[PDB]
Design a protein around this ligand. Structure first.
Ligand SMILES: N[C@@H](CCC(=O)O)C(=O)O
Ligand SMILES: N[C@@H](CCC(=O)O)C(=O)O
Ligand SMILES: [Zn+2]
Ligand SMILES: [Zn+2]
Ligand SMILES: [Zn+2]
Lengths: 258, 258
């Protein structure tokens, strides 16, 4: 009856509220996806428990074991009834889980420390002084691994062969690496996160160049889940009611700091 | 065996080739959706025949008869197996047909003749000298009809009762009206079409302001259609393989004229 909603602590989607340690259950969290979950749950008429994905990962199929990790894994292996998170709709994932229509559009973007002489993926690919990386177990890394576009193939080859790893285990780590690397690290991450971070103190990062691709986050459910339909309709309704836009404004721009 | 692909004559998605009268079948047409259908069909491994929707409409449900027209109707009533078209994914359509994940992201946008003193929906809403309208039988019109947001409600109220009609039967008609109206007509249409027209001579129109909303086109199939799955996976694959980006460039920007 209480459905398990897997999600990931990723600002501003799901964040601990400042006074959270005096709260329990869903009350502890706030953010775009918390609001989204609330709104979805309201329309799908379910009780739900927000559960932060144990491994902290979005989800990436180990090529050896074929095991899916992250929230995708939570869904695939029956541990969560629905993932409400900035979980990118991708082909390999759609093969194993269902996604609502996107509740957010985004693209892979480059985050640089302000003043970094990078304006594009091409700029990154044609040089080596500025290291770059992406989130592990995420759609962005897969994008590059799988890309047949020459420049991205080159970036992938660099990243894949980067030592130490230029793959981070959290977005926060990637952002931290950008911020601490005096311009010598650029982070490839989704424009949504990039933009949010760009608006948070210390305001020392920025998104550069256009998006490398265009995709969406969807609310994910186990393949064939009967929840999937209601959730999809809920997402479409929320988008059309302008709630998603309002939420985006509320969580990205309204509190903007830069 | 041959699946019927409904689509609509809407530049640059589907256009007659110059020598179309010499040609038969799919060869008659060219454009983004013609290329996309070709790629989708190749990847789904189906033979298909493009069939231009008779009523030249995207699809809306007549409140009286409850009859779906346009491409949505072609799918709903079993005359087409798939719609490959700039068909907006909407809640009401999703209730009657299936959509792939979006192959294009877009929003309602304002097309003005260059020089028109309008920079936003608010600018349009708060005034009457500049008439504005949208396509009939499309998601844009429904967006305004359905909107509970004051500005758009005001715009809807304006449009609903504007005389003569500010609603056009084709995008082309709306564009032509913008172009002919000396800046006294603005056209609310999807950013995609807006951006395309912006790139075409006489180069006298432009998209202004941000998009009013954010949504996507999906390749549509009849609810529960088996084809739906492969098509969705095809779209995801083509997206990730950069096809859609390439097609967008090919049909919008590469031949750009402005
Ligand atoms: N949204 C991504 C995670 C962030 C990224 O990979 O950039 C995913 O679902 O995997
Ligand atoms: N893409 C829209 C048509 C264009 C518009 O309504 O502005 C639809 O599917 O209805
Ligand atoms: Zn705590
Ligand atoms: Zn002709
Ligand atoms: Zn192909």
């Amino acid at each position: 009856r209480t459905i398990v909603v897997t999600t990931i602590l990723e600002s501003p989607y799901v964040m601990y509220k400042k006074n959270h340690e005096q709260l329990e259950g869903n009350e502890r969290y706030e953010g775009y996806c918390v609001d989204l979950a609330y709104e979805i749950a309201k329309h799908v008429r379910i009780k739900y428990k927000l559960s932060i994905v144990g491994d902290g990962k979005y989800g990436a199929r180990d090529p050896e074991t074929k095991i899916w990790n992250g929230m995708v894994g939570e869904l695939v292996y029956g541990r969560a009834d629905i993932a409400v998170a900035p979980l990118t709709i991708t082909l390999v994932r759609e093969e194993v889980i269902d996604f609502s229509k996107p509740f957010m559009s985004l693209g892979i973007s480059i985050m640089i420390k302000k003043g970094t002489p990078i304006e594009s993926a091409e700029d990154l690919a044609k040089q080596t002084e500025i290291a770059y990386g992406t989130l592990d177990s995420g759609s962005t890394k897969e994008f590059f691994r799988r890309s047949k576009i020459a420049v991205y193939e080159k970036m992938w080859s660099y990243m894949k062969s980067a030592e130490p790893s230029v793959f981070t285990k959290t977005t926060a780590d990637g952002v931290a690496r950008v911020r601490k690397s005096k311009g010598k690290f650029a982070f490839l991450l989704e424009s949504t996160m990039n933009e949010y971070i760009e608006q948070r103190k210390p305001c020392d990062t920025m998104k550069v160049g256009g998006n490398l691709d265009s995709k969406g986050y969807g609310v994910a459910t186990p393949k064939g889940s009967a929840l999937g339909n209601a959730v999809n309709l809920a997402v479409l309704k929320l988008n059309e009611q302008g709630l998603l836009d309002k939420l985006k404004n509320k969580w990205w721009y309204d509190k903007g700091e830069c």
